[PDB]
Design an enzyme around this catalytic site. Structure first.
Site, PDB file in Angstrom:
ATOM      1  N   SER A  91       0.632  -1.452  -0.082  1.00 42.23           N
ATOM      2  CA  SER A  91       0.238   0.140  -0.134  1.00 42.23           C
ATOM      3  C   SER A  91       0.749   1.432   0.115  1.00 42.23           C
ATOM      4  CB  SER A  91      -0.887  -0.128   1.193  1.00 42.23           C
ATOM      5  OG  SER A  91      -1.875   0.937   1.189  1.00 42.23           O
TER       6      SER A  91
ATOM      7  N   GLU B  55      -9.343  -6.290  -3.804  1.00 41.18           N
ATOM      8  CA  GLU B  55      -8.948  -5.279  -2.907  1.00 41.18           C
ATOM      9  C   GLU B  55      -9.765  -4.564  -2.114  1.00 41.18           C
ATOM     10  OE1 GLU B  55      -5.615  -4.434  -2.304  1.00 41.18           O
ATOM     11  OE2 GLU B  55      -4.479  -5.300  -3.928  1.00 41.18           O
TER      12      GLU B  55
ATOM     13  N   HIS C  22      -7.617  -5.906   0.675  1.00 40.56           N
ATOM     14  CA  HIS C  22      -6.354  -5.059   0.669  1.00 40.56           C
ATOM     15  C   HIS C  22      -5.817  -5.431   2.331  1.00 40.56           C
ATOM     16  CE1 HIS C  22      -3.688  -1.918  -0.011  1.00 40.56           C
ATOM     17  NE2 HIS C  22      -4.155  -1.104   0.893  1.00 40.56           N
TER      18      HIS C  22
END
Length: 566
Positions: A214, A347, A467
């Protein structure tokens, strides 16, 4: 986070206290660094492996007082031995579980781990840059334990860097020397420390890999883009992010004023008076207010954070980002080192809880104007061209007559991750020596083993791979447990750390010694490829065409009239 998960977290923090003591040995060791000697210690793991641990190595002067909001300076050296058997504070931030401000301005440290301080051959060095939106995160081992990686013969280094307004305040006025990106400059000074000191811990300074997830992936990519780091490392891995992502930068020069006003400043919108105000404030006071800085319009336009990486308003010696990321890609030294990129298989599933709390978000897919790439849209989001491009996005993700939460989350996977990856791949192909890029897709789902981001997001019991779900298989954390060797989770730990270690070593992520890869033909992506191939990582490892390709091409179509901007 709910009271029940808060109380459980607290019990886990106490348990991690006790475990950490039990795993601490009496085998202290002393290593040399360019600034002085450091004492570390052998620690055990729950798998009964061992590693040497050095935490709290300073790589810059504590950025306090007059150094607040400024580029980092080199640290003061010491003649004796520094105790590094214990972690230092994290950067000032809001604790995601308690909601209280925690941390310290005195946060510029890194940690070094290896199972063997004096190896026969100097080892690949893997440097992890943590994510957290540039506003939270740390290198504490209760979140990022090296316990899985130290099964491999590598040096692993986890760095910290300034977060939030303290790391990313930016002011236009050249006289004030607050151009922005102090936190990225922190990362630069860390990577310089690592190249100049990893030999003291058995590391190969000529085989360094930087990776992050990220915001740590956006960071790894910035470190691959800037001239400041040219040739400092030799592989990069971008896990669910890059600097082209819409959340990965922001022209935040006016928000210093806004933050000041929130903190009680009275005066003009003027960089010097605002800076002088912010220089006096209690660091905690500024960080607590940061969640209030973005305007409604900015949030509507999908600006995710008020402070972050920015294009610097004027050039300085330590300038990290002199141009927009896409322009920087055209000349980037990092285009020509082996690279691996990937995402998870769902995600946007991360935003499950947000959509339950604010269900009226789903109505954004009625026109999808808010998701049009901002360089093509208007801030008002009412222009006819914006409506037309929004209709394209809507066709890609609204599957029936009524937009749904699932549709919203699917869209988010593309807006925030898959589309900017595609943009980056295509731009990089035009400006590279030809060094390979490999793609993975992480598609392994389990709730038998989790990490704290799942608590943060209230994602217990939510099926699918969100995610941050892959991090569990790279790093120990205080919610983990010893898994049986025949368990699908343990097998995935061995696979993920094996692949990452293999790539760090050779620049090629394939290994016959990694279980499940017998029939894997993992080729890098070529410029000529119409469709991306990826290693899909589930219970089985299988090369497949990226399932997301069709939607990726639909997003690309918005640039048909504006190809120079793609």
């Amino acid at each position: 986070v709910s009271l029940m998960e808060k109380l459980k977290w607290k019990i886990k923090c106490i348990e991690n206290k006790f475990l950490n003591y039990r795993l601490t040995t009496n085998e202290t060791v002393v290593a040399e660094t360019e600034y002085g000697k450091v004492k570390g210690v052998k620690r055990l793991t729950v798998y009964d492996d061992s590693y040497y641990s050095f935490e709290g190595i300073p790589y810059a002067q504590p950025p306090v007082g007059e150094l607040r909001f400024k580029a980092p300076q080199r640290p003061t050296p010491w003649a004796g031995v520094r105790d590094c058997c214990n972690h230092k504070d994290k950067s000032v931030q809001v604790d995601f579980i308690t909601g209280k401000v925690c941390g310290s301005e005195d946060c510029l440290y890194l940690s070094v781990y290896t199972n063997n301080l004096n190896p026969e051959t100097k080892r690949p060095v893997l440097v992890y840059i943590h994510g957290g939106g540039f506003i939270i995160g740390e290198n504490h081992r209760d979140m990022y334990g090296p316990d899985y990686f130290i099964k491999k013969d590598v040096v692993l280094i986890n760095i910290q860097y300034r977060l939030g307004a303290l790391g990313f305040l930016s002011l236009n006025s050249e006289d004030l020397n607050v151009p922005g990106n102090a936190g990225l400059k922190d990362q630069v000074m860390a990577l310089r420390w690592i190249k100049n000191n990893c030999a003291n811990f058995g590391g190969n300074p000529d085989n360094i890999t930087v990776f992050g997830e990220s915001a740590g992936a956006a960071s790894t990519h910035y470190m691959m883009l800037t001239e400041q780091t040219r040739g400092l490392f030799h592989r990069g891995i971008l896990m669910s992010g890059n600097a082209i992502c819409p959340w990965a930068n922001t022209q935040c020069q006016h928000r210093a004023f806004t933050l000041a006003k929130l903190a009680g400043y009275k005066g003009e919108d003027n960089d010097k008076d605002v800076l002088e105000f912010l220089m006096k404030a209690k660091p905690q006071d500024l960080i607590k207010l940061e969640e209030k800085v973005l305007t409604l319009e900015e949030r509507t336009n999908k600006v995710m954070f008020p402070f972050g990486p920015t294009v610097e308003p004027y050039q300085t010696a330590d300038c990290v980002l002199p141009k927009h990321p896409r322009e920087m890609v055209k000349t980037a030294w990092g285009n020509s080192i082996p690279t691996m990129m990937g995402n998870t298989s769902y995600e946007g599933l991360f935003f499950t809880s947000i959509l339950k709390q604010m269900p009226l978000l789903v109505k954004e897919l009625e026109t999808c104007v808010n998701f049009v790439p901002s360089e093509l849209a208007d801030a008002e989001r009412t222009a006819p061209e914006t409506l037309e491009m929004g209709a394209k996005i809507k066709k890609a993700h609204v599957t029936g007559e009524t937009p749904t939460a699932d549709n919203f989350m699917d869209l988010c996977s593309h807006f925030y991750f898959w589309f900017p990856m595609h943009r980056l791949l295509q731009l990089r192909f035009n400006h590279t020596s030809g060094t390979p890029v490999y793609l993975y897709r992480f598609d392994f789902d389990s709730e038998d083993l989790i990490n704290p981001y799942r608590i943060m997001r209230s994602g217990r019991g939510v099926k699918g791979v969100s995610h941050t779900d892959e991090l569990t298989y790279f790093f120990w954390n205080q919610l983990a447990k010893r898994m049986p060797k025949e368990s699908r989770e343990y097998k995935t730990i061995e696979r993920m750390t094996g692949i990452w270690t293999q790539f760090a070593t050779t620049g090629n992520p394939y290994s016959n010694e990694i279980e499940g890869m017998e029939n894997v033909s993992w080729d890098p992506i070529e410029k000529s490829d119409e469709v991306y191939k990826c290693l899909n990582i589930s219970d089985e490892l299988k090369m497949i065409d990226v399932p997301e390709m069709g939607k990726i091409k639909q997003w690309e179509s918005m640039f048909e009239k504006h190809r120079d901007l793609f």
